[PDB]
Design an enzyme around this catalytic site. Structure first.
Site, PDB file in Angstrom:
ATOM      1  N   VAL A  60      -6.616  12.096   2.046  1.00  0.00           N
ATOM      2  CA  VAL A  60      -7.110  11.205   3.080  1.00  0.00           C
ATOM      3  C   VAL A  60      -8.447  11.752   3.559  1.00  0.00           C
ATOM      4  O   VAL A  60      -8.529  12.863   4.093  1.00  0.00           O
ATOM      5  CB  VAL A  60      -6.139  11.107   4.278  1.00  0.00           C
ATOM      6  CG1 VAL A  60      -6.771  10.256   5.374  1.00  0.00           C
ATOM      7  CG2 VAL A  60      -4.811  10.493   3.831  1.00  0.00           C
ATOM      8  N   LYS A  67     -10.619   3.598   8.441  1.00  0.00           N
ATOM      9  CA  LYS A  67      -9.872   2.362   8.256  1.00  0.00           C
ATOM     10  C   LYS A  67      -8.570   2.402   9.042  1.00  0.00           C
ATOM     11  O   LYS A  67      -8.152   1.392   9.605  1.00  0.00           O
ATOM     12  CB  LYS A  67      -9.584   2.117   6.772  1.00  0.00           C
ATOM     13  CG  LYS A  67     -10.801   1.612   5.991  1.00  0.00           C
ATOM     14  CD  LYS A  67     -10.484   1.376   4.523  1.00  0.00           C
ATOM     15  CE  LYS A  67     -11.658   0.713   3.808  1.00  0.00           C
ATOM     16  NZ  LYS A  67     -12.876   1.572   3.816  1.00  0.00           N
ATOM     17  N   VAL A  98       0.198 -10.211 -14.864  1.00  0.00           N
ATOM     18  CA  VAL A  98       0.746 -10.637 -16.150  1.00  0.00           C
ATOM     19  C   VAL A  98       0.478  -9.510 -17.139  1.00  0.00           C
ATOM     20  O   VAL A  98      -0.667  -9.096 -17.292  1.00  0.00           O
ATOM     21  CB  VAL A  98       0.048 -11.904 -16.695  1.00  0.00           C
ATOM     22  CG1 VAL A  98       0.735 -12.346 -17.990  1.00  0.00           C
ATOM     23  CG2 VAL A  98       0.069 -13.021 -15.654  1.00  0.00           C
ATOM     24  N   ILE A 101      -2.775  -8.919 -19.319  1.00  0.00           N
ATOM     25  CA  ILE A 101      -3.968  -9.350 -18.608  1.00  0.00           C
ATOM     26  C   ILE A 101      -4.432  -8.205 -17.719  1.00  0.00           C
ATOM     27  O   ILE A 101      -3.792  -7.880 -16.722  1.00  0.00           O
ATOM     28  CB  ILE A 101      -3.707 -10.608 -17.732  1.00  0.00           C
ATOM     29  CG1 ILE A 101      -3.210 -11.762 -18.619  1.00  0.00           C
ATOM     30  CG2 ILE A 101      -4.994 -11.023 -17.010  1.00  0.00           C
ATOM     31  CD1 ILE A 101      -3.214 -13.133 -17.944  1.00  0.00           C
ATOM     32  N   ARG A 144      13.507  -5.166 -11.227  1.00  0.00           N
ATOM     33  CA  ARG A 144      13.903  -3.818 -11.589  1.00  0.00           C
ATOM     34  C   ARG A 144      15.210  -3.889 -12.360  1.00  0.00           C
ATOM     35  O   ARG A 144      15.857  -4.937 -12.404  1.00  0.00           O
ATOM     36  CB  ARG A 144      14.052  -2.937 -10.349  1.00  0.00           C
ATOM     37  CG  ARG A 144      12.711  -2.612  -9.689  1.00  0.00           C
ATOM     38  CD  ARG A 144      12.815  -1.446  -8.729  1.00  0.00           C
ATOM     39  NE  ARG A 144      13.132  -0.181  -9.392  1.00  0.00           N
ATOM     40  CZ  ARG A 144      12.282   0.508 -10.148  1.00  0.00           C
ATOM     41  NH1 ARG A 144      11.050   0.058 -10.350  1.00  0.00           N
ATOM     42  NH2 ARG A 144      12.655   1.663 -10.687  1.00  0.00           N
ATOM     43  N   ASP A 187      12.429   3.653 -21.655  1.00  0.00           N
ATOM     44  CA  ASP A 187      11.557   4.440 -22.510  1.00  0.00           C
ATOM     45  C   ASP A 187      12.425   5.289 -23.434  1.00  0.00           C
ATOM     46  O   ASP A 187      13.133   6.182 -22.985  1.00  0.00           O
ATOM     47  CB  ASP A 187      10.641   5.321 -21.652  1.00  0.00           C
ATOM     48  CG  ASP A 187       9.508   5.938 -22.452  1.00  0.00           C
ATOM     49  OD1 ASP A 187       9.055   5.310 -23.431  1.00  0.00           O
ATOM     50  OD2 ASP A 187       9.059   7.045 -22.092  1.00  0.00           O
TER      51      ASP A 187
HETATM   52 NA    NA Z   1      -1.657  -6.944 -16.329  1.00  0.00          NA
HETATM   53 NA    NA Z   2      -7.837  14.919   3.952  1.00  0.00          NA
END
Ligand code: NA
Ligand code: NA
Ligand code: NA
Ligand code: NA
Length: 327
Positions: A60, A67, A98, A101, A144, A187
């Site tokens: 950070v 922000k 997608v 893409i 999931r 996997d």
């Molecule tokens: Na994509």
């Molecule tokens: Na920091």
DNA sequence: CCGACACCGCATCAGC
DNA sequence: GCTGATGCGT
DNA sequence: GTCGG
């Protein structure tokens, strides 16, 4: 594991920013910077009160601290609000969801007026094979996979692999191997005693059998060492059909298999630390091998590895269960 | 200040 | 046709 | 955007 209610607004914001950097500005490093910031904050066990407080966390910096101050005082961020309403940027950002893409394809599409899935559906001719499959299973791919389903999937994979050749060795890695209660995909790491680094269809025969029993339904890509595709558990006559899932199968040389299982089991954090520890011990560990580092920094030939433990032994670090490799 | 931020297989493009 | 670069994904 | 040589 602090509840999102703590700094969820902040973490959501940074992740949304992360996505725009990646998909719209095509600034992959800023994408990862925001992800890292959101990760460290998502772990922080305190409700952040200011940007100054957040800045103490590694990852950070000045800009994100600023922000955070804006978000804490206003409940929003002007730059984020504006880009959300931006028809072009929101569309480009969206299309990347997608599979197939990426930032480039999404920009090209939005440039020619193709902004929605409906638009994509009407323009099959402009999509490559991967993208058509990504479009076809858009919803399923974002769902999931419950561990129970991962187990049934493993059952089929291990059974068919052994059926092709009982000498194959197959291991389902990823968070699933660490014990996770849900996975995003499957996997599979595959090897065979006949295949080594310095030695001469092994993958093909497995993919083919999986298709023969109709487990694998689609192919995104397939070469001699890596297959990427889609699979689906068989449905019970009457039962709602299971969602289509992403499954990858990698063929790896026997002498490099366990370094492979180790790496693809993760987590990403555990890999970082272990590779660190390995260095100070005089070893360099990557996805394929573990090697000794001479006094002047010259790497020697790879060391023999016949199990995950061998790797652990080499660097003096008691073998740790996959369930305990969270970090 | 300014370079690193991982390495790589496959599909496909861009250049010849 | 061949070779290298790019896009994409893990 | 953040870190650090
Ligand atoms: Na994509
Ligand atoms: Na920091
Ligand atoms: Na995506
Ligand atoms: Na056999």
């Amino acid at each position: 594991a602090p509840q999102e209610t703590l700094n969820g607004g902040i973490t959501d914001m940074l992740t949304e920013l992360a996505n725009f950097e990646k998909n719209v500005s095509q600034a992959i490093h800023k994408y990862n910077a925001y992800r890292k910031a959101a990760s460290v904050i998502a772990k922080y066990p305190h409700k952040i009160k200011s940007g100054a407080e957040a800045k103490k966390l590694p990852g950070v910096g000045t800009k994100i601290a600023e922000k955070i101050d804006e978000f804490l005082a206003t409940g929003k961020l002007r730059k984020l609000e504006k880009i959300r309403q931006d028809d072009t940027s929101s569309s480009i950002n969206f299309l990347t969801r997608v599979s197939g893409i990426g930032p480039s394809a999404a920009r090209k599409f939005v440039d020619e007026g193709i902004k929605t899935l409906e638009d994509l559906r009407k323009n099959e001719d402009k999509l490559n094979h991967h993208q058509r499959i990504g479009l076809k299973y858009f919803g399923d791919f974002e769902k999931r996979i419950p561990r129970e389903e991962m187990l049934q999937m493993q059952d089929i994979v291990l059974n068919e692999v052994k059926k092709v050749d009982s000498e194959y060795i197959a291991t389902v890695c990823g968070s699933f191997r660490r014990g996770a209660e849900s996975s995003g995909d499957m996997d599979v790491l595959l090897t065979h005693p006949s295949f080594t680094s310095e030695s001469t269809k092994l993958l093909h025969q497995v993919v083919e059998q999986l298709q023969k029993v109709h487990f694998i339904t689609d192919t995104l890509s397939k070469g001699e060492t890596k297959f990427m595709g889609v699979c689906q558990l068989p449905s019970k006559n009457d039962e709602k059909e299971y969602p289509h899932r992403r499954i990858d199968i990698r063929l790896i040389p026997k002498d490099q298999y366990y370094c492979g299982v180790l790496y693809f089991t993760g987590s990403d954090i555990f890999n970082k630390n272990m590779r660190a520890h390995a260095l100070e011990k005089g070893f360099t560990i990557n996805e394929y091998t573990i090697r000794p580092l001479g006094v002047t920094g010259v790497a020697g030939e790879p060391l023999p590895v016949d199990s995950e433990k061998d790797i652990f032994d080499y660097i003096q670090w008691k073998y740790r269960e996959p369930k305990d490799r969270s970090e």
